[PDB]
Write a protein that binds this ligand. Structure first.
Ligand SMILES: Nc1ncnc2c1ncn2[C@@H]1O[C@H](COP(=O)(O)OP(=O)(O)O)[C@@H](O)[C@H]1O
Ligand SMILES: N#CC[NH+]1CCN(c2cccc(Cl)c2)CC1
Ligand SMILES: [Mg+2]
Ligand SMILES: [Mg+2]
Length: 265
């Protein structure tokens, strides 16, 4: 159906390990979108064909205001192309680099939007497993959308693929290669809440080896400026035992969230 000739390509929007993402306009309708380009030789070499299939299958069927749309795809014997909703305000990662830290209202609003998106995902037993600032995009009204479903799966699960880059957002059960479920995304939500308020993630370290140690032992402390309500929510999410981590309704109803968020459940 779709082919490369149907699109005019424009400015580079971002890069990932596999994805090179470009702004593009479809020629007959003038529809603006984002084209995510993957090289087949790199996909085959890394053995991640199955991840790509899951990204397409899972993401194309989800429909939620806080989740990025996948519209379709095509390929041409050197490349695979994913046709995505364009997010005009960029990544949360870029906003954090710009501002250094977010205030409590901005943070609580982003957490509400994440929790709504994840609540919808978990109702289908979909777990994302790669929630982190460079995969959170911003729509035209500044609203958060979750993207990059390459690591997503159905629960429960083990891991069959090699961990790539940073350990910073993963819970103990994932880094220890044990069996895991939906509660992995709740741990990541706690890491994000800390990083939004403080400006760095809570187990950050100079080497892989020490980061691993800090995560498995849950070694984090708070700077003086983090308030009692934020500390309570974060401490509830960063529990070693996944069954003790709260439900998403409990996050959305937490008094610090309700006091500070400017959007509803
Ligand atoms: N729909 C989009 N709109 C705007 N920018 C995007 C979009 N998708 C990706 N990007 C940019 O490209 C980067 C990589 O895309 P991603 O889908 O996360 O690739 P990878 O799977 O390689 O991590 C993002 O972190 C962001 O900077
Ligand atoms: N390397 C490689 C081989 N590819 C593996 C998976 N492929 C795939 C999966 C979902 C959607 C689309 Cl367009 C393509 C195509 C070929
Ligand atoms: Mg990504
Ligand atoms: Mg990916």
């Amino acid at each position: 159906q779709w082919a490369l000739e149907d699109f005019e390509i424009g400015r580079p929007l971002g890069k990932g390990k596999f994805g090179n993402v470009y702004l593009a306009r479809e020629k007959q309708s003038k529809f603006i979108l984002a084209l995510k380009v993957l090289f087949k030789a790199q996909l085959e070499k890394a053995g991640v064909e199955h991840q790509l299939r899951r990204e397409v299958e899972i993401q194309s069927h989800l429909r939620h205001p806080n989740i990025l749309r996948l519209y379709g795809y095509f390929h041409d014997a050197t490349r695979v192309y994913l046709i995505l909703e364009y997010a005009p305000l960029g990544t949360v990662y870029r906003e954090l680099q710009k501002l250094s830290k977010f205030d409590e209202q901005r943070t609580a609003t982003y957490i509400t939007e994440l929790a709504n998106a994840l609540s919808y995902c978990h109702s289908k037993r979909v777990i994302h497993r790669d929630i982190k600032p460079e995969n959170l995009l911003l729509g035209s009204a500044g609203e958060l959308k979750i993207a990059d479903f390459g690591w997503s799966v159905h629960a429960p699960s083990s891991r069959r693929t090699t961990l790539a880059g940073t350990l910073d957002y993963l819970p103990p059960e994932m880094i220890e290669g044990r069996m895991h479920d939906e509660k992995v995304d709740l741990w990541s939500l706690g890491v994000l809440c800390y990083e939004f308020l403080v400006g760095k993630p809570p187990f950050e370290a100079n080497t892989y080896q020490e980061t691993y140690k800090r995560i498995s032992r849950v070694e984090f402390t708070f700077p003086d400026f983090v308030t009692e309500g934020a500390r309570d929510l974060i401490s509830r999410l960063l529990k070693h035992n996944p069954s003790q981590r709260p439900m998403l309704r409990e996050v959305l109803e937490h008094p610090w969230i309700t006091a500070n968020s400017s959007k509803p459940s």
